[PDB]
Amino acid sequence: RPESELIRQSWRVVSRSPLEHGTVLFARLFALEPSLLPLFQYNGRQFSSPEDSLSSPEFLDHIRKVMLVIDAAVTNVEDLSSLEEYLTSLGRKHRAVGVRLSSFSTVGESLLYMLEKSLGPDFTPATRTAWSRLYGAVVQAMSRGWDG
């Protein structure tokens, strides 16, 4: 595909500082959907404000976990069927923590935001379209974890 190379090339810049970049992604996510904040319950406590999440080692570790799953989809961009079972179970896990499948749409917008902001003029509409398709295929696999 041309799209596989566009994904690989765009990811390279972002993937070298995944926490910095994932921090943009989550900052955007909470600005768009503040109701996601309480779902991160570590030692049974709720973050009051988005800035609270950024001082939590566990929350920051979760950002790294996200960027690593994205990294695995990039590695497997030419066939995501090989991550499908892992992703379905990732979905079931998120269902169990309280995340609504519809919130993954906001996550997708946040990812695209973070890419746009990091790549600037290099985030061509083909690059946008490629990532939208890759993320959509990830979410399709994850959705199996909600049943349907």
Both tokens of 36, joined, read 């996601």
Distances in Å between the alpha carbon of 83 and those of 4, 64, 67, 133, 148? 16, 18, 15, 15, 18
Query: What count of Cα atoms within 13 Å lies in the side-chain half-sphere of residue 123?
Result: 16
Query: What count of Cα atoms within 13 Å lies in the side-chain half-sphere of residue 10?
Result: 30
Contact mark string toward ligand [Kr], 40..59, x via CB under 6 A: ----------x--xx-----
Backbone angles phi, psi at 44, to 5 degrees: 50, 10
> Which partner, ligand HEM, ligand [Kr], none, binds residue 26 by CB below 5 to 8 Å per kind?
ligand [Kr]
> Which partner, ligand HEM, ligand [Kr], none, binds residue 134 by CB below 5 to 8 Å per kind?
ligand [Kr]
Residue 40 binding ligand HEM, by CB under 6 A: yes
> Which partner, ligand [Kr], ligand HEM, none, binds residue 93 by CB below 5 to 8 Å per kind?
ligand HEM
Of the residues 18, 108, 119, 144, which one makes contact with ligand [Kr] according to CB under 6 A: 108
Of the residues 6, 112, 130, 141, which one makes contact with ligand [Kr] according to CB under 6 A: 112
Residue 137 binding ligand HEM, by CB under 6 A: no
Give, to the nearest 10 degrees, the angle between helix 2-15 and helix 125-143: 90
Both tokens of 143, joined, read 């959705």
| CB within 8 Å of 70: residues ≥ 6 apart | 11, 111
Residue 21 binding ligand HEM, by CB under 6 A: no
Chain contacts with ligand [Kr] (rule: CB under 6 A): 26-27, 30, 50, 53-54, 66, 70, 73, 107-108, 111-112, 131-132, 134-135, 138
Residues making up the annotated binding site for heme b are 62, 94
